[PDB]
Design a protein around this ligand. Structure first.
Ligand SMILES: [Zn+2]
Lengths: 68, 1316, 67, 99, 260
């Protein structure tokens, strides 16, 4: 009776501790996505600069060559 | 010391001054300044000369140009009158004929003794030769011109005294010579008349009315020239005599068909050219220039006819017609003269000759003379297309640069491992990453879309500024330009009108190099990398006119000394590192090649070709096109601004021609720092210059050709030799295509390749001429050889007609002249298929040269007799005849060895000479002279020339003048060598060190002089000896002031006494010989033993008792014996008894034959026959010194003394690091099979197998040369060796007892010596 | 009776919690696998874009000093 | 024993509540990351095609181009090279075409 | 009492566990949505390689173009303004488009410099080159006559008149190339030039059934001396291929024919 209750309570406490440890590990692994996703933002940003540079090159092309 | 042959261009600007000093008129020069300039101190005193005043007292004031008169003199001058030369050249003519006939002998006796001879023998052979020599057209004229040359050379020698004036009166002509000037007085009736009544020569200087009262009651007129047209005329007469004699003699060997054109057509050609020149002046050489292309056109039509085979002839005919009509309209030719003037090219076009005769006729182009050059037209020719605007396409430049980088990468991949570790971003090459990772290099088929990626490849400095081991490149006695500060000091200060403010001191390269305080390669690199060639005082670049040529005028450039050093450095670096990825000469005849090898690299195979001119590229190069290539060349090294010196400094210069007697127009003292530009000056030179940066331009051309090959999928091979580039296209066919459509397809492929290349090259800014670029199928002419469908064509008149009794051989040395004649004879007999013409010419010239030097020597006084002051009695015919029979190795004067008719490279010059002397003495009943004729007395030679002359004898009469010049140069260096780097190499005890090294090198047992000579060249003493030799002519010995500042004694007296001693050494006989050697040479009857005894007795002081090995070799003429078997016969020698022999057999397949198969020489068959500078020399020196000595433990105690003076690495680290040809045309060699395996035990041995094949082939070719191919009654030949001159060579090594015991660590200076 | 029912309920709750933890671990493993699969290509694309931008900017800098 | 059981139950409830709050925060973070990550992709895809087409047009028109030389390239190159090292203008007199 | 409190606590724990399960399900849904939302990004790498290749091509080409020209190249406005000062191409390399400069060459209205038009003409003259006509010579009537005279011996022979007639007829019929090719082919076999001319007359279809030409002369002095030995009376129906080369008409009505 009382021994069974104590054993069940101890098992429940151990299971809760293990679940909290697993949740902490999950949170720690999840919080590593910022480092992996920052280059995505960097390459998204650099495309606009590359397009602007190419547009400037095209515009400066018509300055030199005579064309029609 | 005036020279006997032309060596400078012909300019007549100063002759305007001379006519002003005598009250005459002549407008040679286009510069008006010479019309009213002050006269020099000389050529002004002519007013006080009585001979000149009397000579010109009955002639008009007006004169005539010498351009229109040379052809008249060439035919109106013969030796009949009075000449002031007392020993006359024609006096000794019978002896010359006697000697020539005596050489038509033993040559024949030697040939019969060998076994060659000839099947057809005619009794009348000496009579025909005598009649041919006697009945020559240019004989007495040649003798008269040689008397004139002797007299004018004697006059030029003084040119400061009363003995500088001479007078000759011959029939219709009068000649007066005075100090480099000649006056010709000629009748007016010999000049062709213009339709206005005046001569053709006078219509360019005077008007018709002006040149009719000046003459009036005069019958003779005067022309004035220099003493250099006379030398030219003498050369022309000698060449014409030689060619006529050879053509006449060749008709006796082969009456049916000879390989020389004729002796009657050439005379008509000479007369037609003379008439054309006499009508048109110097302007008529534009028509003479067409002889060579017309001959090539006629050769090309001697094969299968194609629709585009005759295009070359048609284009040349149209060009010659246009040229003839454009230069004639202004001149007022008579209706009769307009028909005779069209006879040179008209005769050339209507020729009917075999290809061999046309190839021989190709060689007469300079037999009419050379034009007179002007500094205005020459510079206007190069200015018109060097400042021209160009239009370019960037895209083709892009692919050219990409192909350049591709070729560099491929060359670096093929050798030195694989790839080169690209230190560049791997994104910019999407497609070359796969090949790099797997270490593979892409093949041609799929390199069409990744070509641009090669633009993005980067690497470290693959090459290094090292491996320069020849200091003679920095001292070559060439010409440089003066500094910009004093640039007008190269003109005579009387035509200029003012004294130049600044005067230079020296202008010779060796003198400026010996005065260079701070030399070394890194100094030149620092000079170039800092852009120090842009300094204001280093920008002159003068011009200089070229030598004998038929052009309007060509020039070469000269730069100041440091810029010349930079150019030499750039060429040296670029020759070693680059210019290897672009193979220059790939000359190949696909006709005489085997299958499965040409086809393998061609992926039946048929090849066509076309030739372009690479010279016209030079002036068409612009910086806008060559900038990327130059920058890449800079990057491949560690340099920064080294390879772009020319394009940076040339446009900033002032272009002018440095002629002494006419400066640039409108030049005064005020406008000296900023001179104006006119008809002979300009500023903006934007192209290139001849010679400068040639390797880079050749590399760019190769890159363009490779780009064309990539674009047009055909296999292309490019070859460069001289100023022409040959491109060969290989077609590859799927077989079963007949034989006529295949050639048409090959020609079409070649034409389309030519069109594509023309488009690419034009897009790059360089224009080809479609009317001058032409397509060939089987006829290929390139470099030194011409082939017509795989059959080689003869060319022997190139060198045979240049034989002359007078040359430039240091103080008119007899030995040098005879050696030059012998070399010319060997080179001539190498070509063609006849023998007797060239030898008869050489025999004629040898005796005549001997007589000229005996009687008329310029180095001595007038009236001297060399043959009288030595013997004390007149020199008779027998003494000279016997002196010319002893070979030069034994101390004689014989340079024409009959054995050279078989092979050119000789195993032993002593045994062959002994055999020749014995045969000659056996022909005559004078057998008992062999012993007291070769013994002689040994001289006093140390162990310094034994190394330099391994195979030789210690006789004083066989030496030359090289040691004298070496001593002169050594003392000149000792007196003034402040170079600070020559002083380190040439220290006080250099002679002692060199002598000790050479003495130790010959201290072994047994002694091998060849190994010692081989290893001595890598020592510092070898480098010193190499540097010491840079003198080449007999004018630096006198004109160079630095040499003549040694005081002591004058060099003239020493030269005279040396000449007298040498002349006493020969022709004396039985006065310079001993009796111990003669008694020791008795009863030997073996040439090898005689040679060994002679070599042992000589060098006795050098070789006390140690035997000498590795020098004596047998004579192959005495070693073998030919049998000449026929099909239905058996060899008598093989039946008797070991009888080793060599077998020669004849094939039957002909493949090709032009024009017929009558002669075996016209046909062919299948046939078949980065390390530093001193690291190398250290490695080979160690390797050879280790290889020679092996059976000893001293192999480490002898390497160190030699190795410590060359490389920093010690021993045990270097250890870790460790052709005979023939004188016959290669036509019969393709129709013979030579078997040497029948020798059995090979008689290692004493037989050179490289020469047995040559001997057999040459014997077969000489035996059957004038006989019909179907008349040859012999099938195979046996060469049976005799057991009298064959020995075995046991293996033997070198044993060294002691060591050098000499310190060589003091040589820690740069360049050709130890490097860190 | 009541004690046994409470014990059964506690055991069922423990089983549900264990199942939830196992599902969470499986989801974490799936997320890790997805991240490992997707990390590299975006890095390569970003590097290529940055290199191209740098080289084109170098071109523009070279061309600027021409007018 | 009742007090100990009550304390244990309260602690368990608090721990589970904290775990639920952590899970909710993780859900919010994941939703925010998903929303922010895939926002500019459409613009990137739109711009890639335009950049490719404009670069292709430039490469195509590079082929139809002609260049004419002039007599000032060498002097300008020499002046730039002399300015690169020891950056003083080259000594007088002036070069061929200085401008 | 105590049992009721235990039951209530157990019920509360069950409710909180259910809420946690719902939260975990929401987490799983969010994670799977994020995982499924990355599909467009995965295919983005496919379209970037082509852009990289094209960009690298353009970079290489234009880097070489800018490096090969100098620091001073001048713009289109600068060169147009400079063209107003003489011809005088501006210093430094200028850049043009092929079509624009080509079209401006013909439109001679704004003083295009002479050097520029010569340079463009030389550059463009090489475009019309093919495998055929690469080095094919151009033959006119006068050049053909001059070539034909170089083979015949002497002067004033009737063969000169035959050559003149052949050249005139070929110029009229525009068949100089065929005549020259036939002449060269006949000469290749080794025939005499007179035989080659005879074969040309008898073989070319134009000369077949052709009336001989007539030349007016005042007297016998016009004809050359070498031609004096080949005079015949004029036949009623002469033929050029039969031997009659020309008919000489005198001022007084006399008619003579020349035959080989
Ligand atoms: Zn035998």
């Amino acid at each position: 009776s009382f021994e069974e209750v104590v054993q069940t309570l101890a098992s429940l406490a151990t299971v809760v501790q293990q679940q909290t440890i697993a949740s902490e590990s999950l949170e720690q692994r999840i919080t590593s996505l910022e480092n992996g996703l920052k280059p995505v933002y960097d390459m998204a940003k650099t495309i606009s600069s590359l397009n602007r540079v190419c547009a400037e090159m095209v515009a400066k092309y018509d300055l030199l060559v005579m064309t029609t | 010391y005036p020279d006997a042959r032309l060596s400078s261009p012909i300019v007549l600007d100063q002759c305007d001054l001379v006519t002003r000093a005598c009250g005459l008129y002549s407008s040679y020069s286009l510069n008006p300044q010479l019309r009213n300039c002050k006269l020099p101190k000389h050529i002004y005193r002519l007013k006080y000369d009585v001979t000149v005043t009397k000579f010109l007292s009955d002639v008009p004031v007006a004169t005539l140009p010498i351009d229109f008169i040379v052809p008249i003199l060439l035919k109106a001058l013969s030796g009949n009158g009075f000449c002031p030369v007392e020993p006359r050249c024609q006096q000794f003519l019978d002896e010359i004929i006697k000697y020539t006939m005596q050489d038509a002998l033993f040559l024949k006796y030697y040939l019969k003794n060998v076994g060659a001879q000839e099947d057809c023998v005619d009794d009348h052979f000496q009579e025909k030769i005598l009649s041919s020599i006697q009945g020559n057209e240019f004989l007495h004229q040649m003798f008269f011109w040689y008397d004139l040359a002797i007299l004018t050379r004697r006059g030029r020698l003084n040119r400061g005294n009363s003995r500088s004036t001479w007078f000759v009166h011959d029939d219709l002509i009068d000649i007066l010579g005075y100090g480099d000037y000649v006056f010709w007085k000629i009748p007016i009736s010999l000049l062709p008349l213009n339709t206005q009544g005046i001569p053709h020569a006078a219509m360019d200087w005077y008007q018709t009315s002006v040149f009719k009262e000046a003459v009036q009651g005069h019958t003779h007129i005067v022309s004035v020239s220099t003493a250099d047209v006379l030398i030219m005329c003498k050369d022309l007469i000698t060449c014409r005599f030689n060619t006529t004699l050879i053509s006449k003699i060749a008709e006796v060997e082969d009456p049916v068909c000879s390989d020389y054109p004729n002796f009657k057509i050439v005379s008509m050609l000479y007369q037609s050219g003379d008439y054309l020149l006499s009508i048109l002046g110097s302007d008529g050489y534009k028509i003479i220039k067409f002889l060579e292309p017309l001959c090539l056109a006629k050769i090309q039509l001697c094969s299968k006819y194609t629709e585009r085979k005759g295009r070359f002839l048609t284009q040349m005919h149209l060009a010659v017609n246009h040229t003839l009509e454009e230069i004639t309209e202004i001149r007022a030719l008579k209706p009769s003269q307009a028909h005779k003037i069209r006879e040179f090219h008209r005769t050339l076009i209507r020729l009917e000759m075999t290809p061999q005769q046309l190839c021989e006729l190709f060689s007469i182009q300079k037999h009419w003379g050379h034009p007179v050059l002007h500094s205005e037209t020459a510079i206007q020719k190069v200015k018109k297309h060097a400042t021209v605007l160009k239009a370019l396409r960037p895209i083709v430049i892009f692919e050219t640069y990409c192909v350049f980088k591709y070729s560099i990468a491929k060359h670096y991949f093929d050798s030195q491992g694989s790839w080169y570790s690209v230190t560049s971003d791997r994104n910019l090459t999407p497609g070359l990453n796969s090949y790099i990772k797997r270490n593979q290099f892409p093949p041609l088929p799929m390199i069409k879309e990744l070509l641009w990626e090669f633009y993005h490849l980067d690497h470290p400095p693959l090459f290094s500024t090292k491996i320069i081991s020849d200091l003679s490149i920095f001292i070559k006695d060439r010409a440089t330009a003066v500094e910009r500060t004093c640039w007008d000091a190269v003109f005579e200060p009387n035509v200029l009108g003012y004294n130049p403010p600044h005067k230079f001191s020296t202008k010779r390269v060796p003198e400026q190099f010996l005065e260079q305080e701070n030399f070394s390669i890194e100094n030149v690199l620092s000079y170039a990398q800092k852009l120090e060639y842009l300094l204001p005082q280093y920008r002159n670049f003068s011009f200089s006119l070229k030598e004998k040529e038929l052009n309007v005028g060509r020039t070469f450039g000269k730069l100041p000394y440091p810029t010349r050093n930079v150019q030499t450095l750039c060429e040296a670096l670029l020759a070693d590192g680059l210019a290897k990825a672009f193979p220059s000469n790939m000359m190949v005849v696909t006709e005489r090649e085997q299958k499965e090898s040409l086809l393998h690299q061609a992926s039946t195979v048929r090849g066509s070709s076309f030739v372009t001119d690479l010279e016209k590229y030079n002036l068409a190069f612009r910086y806008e096109f060559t900038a990327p290539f130059i920058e890449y060349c800079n990057r491949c090294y560690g340099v920064k601004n080294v390879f772009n010196w020319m394009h940076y400094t040339i446009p900033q210069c002032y272009m002018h021609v440095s002629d002494y007697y006419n400066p640039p127009h409108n030049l005064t003292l005020e406008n000296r720092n900023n001179p104006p530009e006119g008809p002979s000056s300009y500023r903006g030179h934007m192209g290139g210059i001849e010679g400068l940066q040639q390797k880079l331009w050749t590399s760019i051309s190769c890159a363009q050709i490779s780009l064309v090959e990539i674009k047009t999928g055909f296999k292309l091979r490019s070859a460069v030799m001289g100023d022409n580039q040959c491109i060969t296209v290989l077609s590859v066919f799927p077989l079963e295509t007949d034989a006529d459509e295949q050639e048409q397809s090959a020609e079409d492929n070649a034409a389309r390749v030519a069109a594509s290349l023309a488009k690419v090259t034009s897009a790059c800014g360089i224009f080809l001429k479609p009317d001058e670029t032409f397509v060939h199928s089987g006829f290929i002419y390139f470099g030194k050889k011409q082939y017509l469908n795989g059959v080689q064509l003869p060319q022997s008149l190139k060198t045979a007609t240049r034989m002359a009794p007078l040359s430039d051989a240091i103080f008119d040395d007899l030995q040098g002249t005879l050696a030059s004649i012998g070399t010319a004879f060997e080179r001539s007999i190498s070509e063609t298929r006849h023998i007797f013409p060239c030898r008869i010419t050489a025999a004629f010239h040898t005796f005549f040269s001997v007589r000229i030097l005996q009687y008329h020597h310029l180095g001595f006084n007038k009236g001297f007799d060399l043959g009288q002051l030595t013997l004390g009695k007149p020199l008779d015919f027998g003494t000279i005849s016997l002196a010319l029979a002893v070979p030069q190795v034994l101390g004689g004067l014989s340079f024409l060895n009959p054995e050279k008719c078989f092979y050119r490279n000789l195993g032993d010059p002593v045994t062959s000479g002994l055999f020749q002397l014995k045969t000659y003495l056996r022909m005559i009943e004078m057998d008992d002279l062999f012993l007291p004729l070769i013994a002689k007395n040994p001289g006093n030679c140390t162990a310094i020339d034994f190394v330099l002359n391994p195979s030789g004898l210690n006789v004083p009469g066989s030496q030359d003048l090289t040691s004298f010049l070496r001593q002169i140069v050594r003392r000149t260096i000792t007196l003034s060598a402040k170079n600070k780097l020559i002083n380190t190499l040439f220290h006080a005890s250099a002679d002692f060190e060199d002598e000790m090294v050479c003495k130790w090198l010959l201290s072994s047992t047994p002694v091998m002089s060849r190994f010692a000579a081989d290893i001595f060249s890598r020592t510092p003493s070898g480098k010193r000896l190499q540097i010491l030799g840079y003198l080449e002519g007999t004018r630096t010995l006198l004109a160079s002031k630095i040499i003549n500042n040694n005081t002591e004694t004058p060099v003239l007296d020493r030269l005279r006494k040396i000449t007298l001693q040498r002349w006493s050494l020969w022709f004396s006989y039985l006065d310079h010989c001993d009796n111990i050697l003669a008694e020791a040479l008795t009863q030997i009857t073996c040439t090898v033993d005689l040679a060994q005894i002679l070599r042992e007795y000589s060098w006795a002081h050098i070789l006390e008792g140690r035997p000498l090995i590795g020098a004596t070799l047998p004579c192959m003429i005495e070693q073998f014996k030919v049998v000449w078997l026929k099909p239905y016969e058996q060899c008598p020698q093989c039946s008797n008894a070991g009888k080793p022999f060599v077998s020669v057999a004849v094939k039957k397949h002909i493949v090709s034959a032009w024009p017929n198969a009558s002669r075996i020489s016209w046909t062919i068959g299948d046939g078949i026959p980065c390390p530093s500078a001193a690291l190398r020399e250290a490695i080979e020196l160690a390797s050879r010194l280790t290889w020679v000595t092996q059976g000893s433990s001293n192999s480490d105690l002898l390497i160190k003394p030699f190795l410590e003076a060359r490389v920093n690495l010690s021993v045990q680290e270097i250890l870790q690091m460790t052709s005979f040809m023939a004188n016959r045309m290669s036509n019969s060699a393709t129709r013979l099979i030579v078997s040497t395996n029948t020798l059995g035990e090979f008689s290692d041995s004493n037989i050179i197998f490289q020469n047995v094949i040559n001997y057999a082939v040459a014997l077969f070719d000489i035996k059957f040369r004038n006989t019909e191919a179907t008349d040859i009654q012999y099938n195979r030949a046996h060469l049976h060796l005799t057991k009298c001159c064959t020995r075995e060579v046991p293996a033997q090594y070198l044993t060294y007892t002691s060591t050098l015991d000499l310190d060589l660590t003091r040589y820690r200076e740069n360049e050709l010596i130890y490097d860190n």
